[PDB]
């Protein structure tokens, strides 16, 4: 039960991943990307501001895993079955002015007195799960998070170098790098271990000077939350060879091709999957633009 | 044991009626050549309040060789804390560091 | 008895793929 | 002559002394290491990076790899069926173009 | 004497588990454990397959 | 609610004392470390589950 | 020197895919601790020589 300051920047909550077998903090490893660029354009619109209404709290019996199931999810390897409301129906809980469901630090939903598990701050997981449940919608009908769209926007994110292409577009940038065999999804796994919601929580709630001085230090951590994401819906990706060293060429970093097969070389999203990491991206990014 | 439509809402106040809903989470990805399926399924029973109370744990097998299936439970803690003996009779947990 | 000589060569075993009718992972 | 030899007189001499001509198997013929950042597999860095590489080094037949393999059959059931639509005309089919 | 308890052996308690198997799971790496071992784990784990 | 009744009826009266029975006793090396601990000797011949 | 060329040509085309197959797992206590650091878990069933 510790308060903040920042909720990363604290140990137990760092992000590292693996170079072929090393570690190296995430923007040590985005630096070693290359972009052809090709035709077309991102022109970036408007993420529709979220469904405002939330899933109803229902007790529901049982120790809802967030942390790793919002992962999972994400950039997991396939979640067999994603937006179940069971999981969000309870961590909306979780967004009342007076609960006992205390969202234990490993990354998961108690009651009353979770013994031993030292929680979150109430108040900070208070505005978390206040969006963050809305994201057990992306299953119904009339809340879609529409995806194309988004995926625009994830691009001159990720990519598109900063200020010049921070203005709106930028071409469809063909990715590729110097892996080691079975690069892009070992390094998903890495990823699929971090502690994500020890970046929203802290997202979702640092005031606003503090917030940009955030939005600063995981630049990085977050591009390389979607980079490894995006390659899922990426097109093709292939090989391209070089001179003995080998270099893991991605169709095209930003033009979602809504693909459900399954790849080798990469995660690869069944259909309801999109329909999640869809909406996600939509709240993440409505909140990290303010 | 299929409950019709008509049945549920006929049936004499008294009767308490079986139902069986699906466990659901234990079923095996389709296919990647499975003959595409053309019409939805439809369900209309629900249960109001949450059943599976019995449940213990649920879901033990892996996911992918590692990641915990979603919907998996683990069995609670309480359920293997065998502690002591109070200072009569009645027996008690384990203290929590804090007797 | 008068002292053999004896010789083994290392045993070999490689049927063909078992196809079984049991997935193992959800 | 004798290349063959991978190792030679297993038996105790006084009870702890090799005996002369004994010859133990050769490191190289067990030092399972890794695989390369691609496939060819390679032995065991020395402390110092990087590895010989089995083929690429020498001639020391390891004894013991890292062989990847399918984690169960792979051909079983399922076998993909495509639903066939012939036009229904033979007469008015394009053709034309290209 | 009055036989106002009975002395049994193995006493059964109340509630018990019951588990119900999908039967078509199996890991096929096959665990097996000292004998004695699977005399003490020996039902727990075998009831849960 | 009457099932409810007869069993809290039955719980009021099961008047059975218990008998140490058969009890086995293995030591260390004969089974594993993990499930030694959680042994503290002579553990009942005839277990349960847990 | 003819025996040395089909032979060649024998590795030349082994295209043959591999099948986990019957792999057994013990674990510590079961086996002995030299073996063990060599053992990492579920060692093949029908294991080779070496």
């Not at chain 1, 942390?67 to 309870?90: C, K, M, P, W």
């Not at chain 5, 199996?26 to 849960?48: C, H, M, Q, W, Y």
């Not at chain 6, 069993?7 to 470390?33: A, C, H, Q």
């Amino acid at each position: 039960q510790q308060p903040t300051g920042g909720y990363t920047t604290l140990e137990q909550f760092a992000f590292t991943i693996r170079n072929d077998g090393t570690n190296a903090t995430p923007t040590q490893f985005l630096q070693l990307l290359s972009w052809e660029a090709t035709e077309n354009e991102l022109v970036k619109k408007t993420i529709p501001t979220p469904e405002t209404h939330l899933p109803s709290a229902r007790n529901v019996p049982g120790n809802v895993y967030i942390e790793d199931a919002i992962t999972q999810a994400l950039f997991g390897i396939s979640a067999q079955n994603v937006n179940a409301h069971g999981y969000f129906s309870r961590l909306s809980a979780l967004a009342l002015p007076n609960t006992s469901a205390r969202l234990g630090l490993d990354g998961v939903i108690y009651n009353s007195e979770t013994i031993n598990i030292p929680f979150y701050d109430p108040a900070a997981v208070a505005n978390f799960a206040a969006t963050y449940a809305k994201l057990g919608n992306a299953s119904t009908p009339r809340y879609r998070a529409d995806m194309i769209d988004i995926y625009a926007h994830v691009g001159l994110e990720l990519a598109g170098t900063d200020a010049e292409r921070a203005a709106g577009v930028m071409p469809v940038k063909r990715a590729k790098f110097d892996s080691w065999e079975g690069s892009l999804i070992s390094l998903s796994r890495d990823v699929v271990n971090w502690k994500i919601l020890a970046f929203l929580i802290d997202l979702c709630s640092l005031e606003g000077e503090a917030l940009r001085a955030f939005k600063t230090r995981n630049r990085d951590v977050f591009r390389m939350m979607l980079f490894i994401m995006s390659t899922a819906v990426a097109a093709n990706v292939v090989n391209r060879k070089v001179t003995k060293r080998v270099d893991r060429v991605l169709e095209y970093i930003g033009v979602n091709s809504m693909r459900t097969a399954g790849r080798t070389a990469t995660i690869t999203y069944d259909l309801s999957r999109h329909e999640f990491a869809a909406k996600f991206l939509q709240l993440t990014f409505t909140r990290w633009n303010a | 044991q299929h409950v019709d439509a008509e049945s549920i809402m006929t049936a004499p106040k008294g009767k308490l009626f079986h139902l069986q809903f699906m466990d659901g989470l234990l079923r095996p990805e389709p296919s990647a050549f499975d003959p595409p399926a053309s019409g939805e399924d439809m369900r209309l029973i629900y249960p109001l309040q949450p059943i599976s109370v019995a449940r213990s744990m649920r879901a033990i097998v892996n996911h992918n060789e590692v990641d915990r299936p979603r919907g998996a439970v683990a069995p609670s803690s309480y359920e293997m804390d065998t502690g002591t003996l109070s200072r009569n009779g009645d027996l008690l947990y384990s203290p929590v560091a804090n007797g | 008895k008068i002292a053999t000589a004896s010789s083994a060569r290392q045993a070999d075993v490689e049927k063909p793929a078992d196809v079984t009718f049991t997935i193992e992972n959800v | 002559i004798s290349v063959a030899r991978s190792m030679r007189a297993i038996v105790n001499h006084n009870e702890v002394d090799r005996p002369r001509g004994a010859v133990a198997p050769s490191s190289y013929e067990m030092d399972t290491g890794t695989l390369s950042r691609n496939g060819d597999l390679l032995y065991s860095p020395v402390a110092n990076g990087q590895v010989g590489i089995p083929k690429l080094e020498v001639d020391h037949i390891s004894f013991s790899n890292v062989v990847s393999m399918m984690t169960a059959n792979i051909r079983t059931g399922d076998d993909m069926a495509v639903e066939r639509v012939n036009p229904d005309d033979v007469r008015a089919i394009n053709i034309r173009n290209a | 004497l009055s036989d106002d308890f009975k002395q049994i052996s193995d006493p059964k308690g109340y509630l018990t588990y019951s588990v119900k198997y999908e039967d078509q799971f199996t890991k096929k790496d096959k665990l097996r454990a000292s004998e004695a071992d699977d005399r003490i784990v020996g039902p727990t784990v075998n009831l849960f397959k | 609610v009457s099932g409810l009744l007869m069993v809290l009826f039955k719980v009021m009266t099961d008047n059975r004392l218990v008998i140490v029975g058969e009890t086995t006793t293995p030591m260390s090396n004969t089974l594993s470390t993990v499930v030694n601990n959680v042994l503290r000797t002579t553990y009942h011949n005839n277990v349960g589950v847990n």
